[PDB]
């Protein structure tokens, strides 16, 4: 019906350090993005563009964000060591820097 249709946006913006990735030759850049896409799929996230993923906007939004950020990505060492920018996007509450927050909280391996 006319109700329950408009949840506030939750999502994330991701920018890999492509320069570091190629210069180091450790990983293949294209498979990093495919691994991120697979994570978004099994967490229930919608891919907006190369950098941006959004929740569907229903009662499972927080759970999808819990899996994508704090189960899959944060414990992916190839991801956290090669990320130039990582943003938690919340329309209602404002955005925040996930790299600076995770280093201060001890989440993930960054160096």
């Amino acid at each position: 019906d006319l109700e329950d249709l408009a949840y506030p946006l939750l999502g994330t913006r991701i920018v890999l350090d492509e320069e570091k990735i190629l210069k180091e030759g450790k990983y293949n850049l294209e498979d990093m993005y495919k691994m991120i896409d697979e994570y978004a799929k099994e967490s229930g996230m919608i891919k907006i563009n190369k950098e941006t993923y959004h929740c569907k906007g229903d009662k499972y939004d927080l759970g999808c964000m819990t899996l994508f950020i704090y189960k899959y990505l944060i414990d992916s060492e190839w991801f956290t060591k090669n990320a130039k920018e990582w943003i938690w996007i919340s329309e209602k509450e404002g955005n925040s820097d996930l790299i600076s927050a995770s280093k201060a909280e001890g989440e993930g391996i960054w160096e």
Partner: protein
């Protein structure tokens, strides 16, 4: 509809000692309130409290509480707490918690 109008939660706590004055089986008053609440647009949670099925404005909520207190005047004698809270958004984590405890990734 009107985005300024939210769903409402009703939560309360009654004194068992005071309820025993009016009911031999103290489970009845909770059943009486449960029936009234479901009649007036609220549903009981599998945890505790009455959540409005649809959004409901504050004027209509307090008319329902007025109606409730006129119906069961022993409420004033037995109430220990009684709160109306505006519900902003409600999120389900049951399946997520099940997912986290799967130890399938590392």
């Amino acid at each position: 509809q009107d985005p300024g109008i939210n769903r409402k939660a009703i939560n309360f706590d009654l004194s068992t000692k005071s309820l025993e004055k009016y009911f031999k089986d103290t489970r009845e008053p909770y059943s009486l309130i449960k029936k009234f609440m479901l009649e007036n647009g609220f549903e009981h949670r599998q945890y505790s409290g009455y959540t409005s099925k649809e959004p409901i404005n504050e004027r209509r909520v307090i008319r329902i509480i007025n109606k409730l207190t006129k119906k069961f005047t022993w409420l004033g004698e037995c109430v220990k707490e009684f709160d109306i809270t505006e519900i902003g958004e409600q999120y389900s984590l049951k399946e997520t918690i099940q997912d986290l405890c799967a130890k399938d990734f590392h």
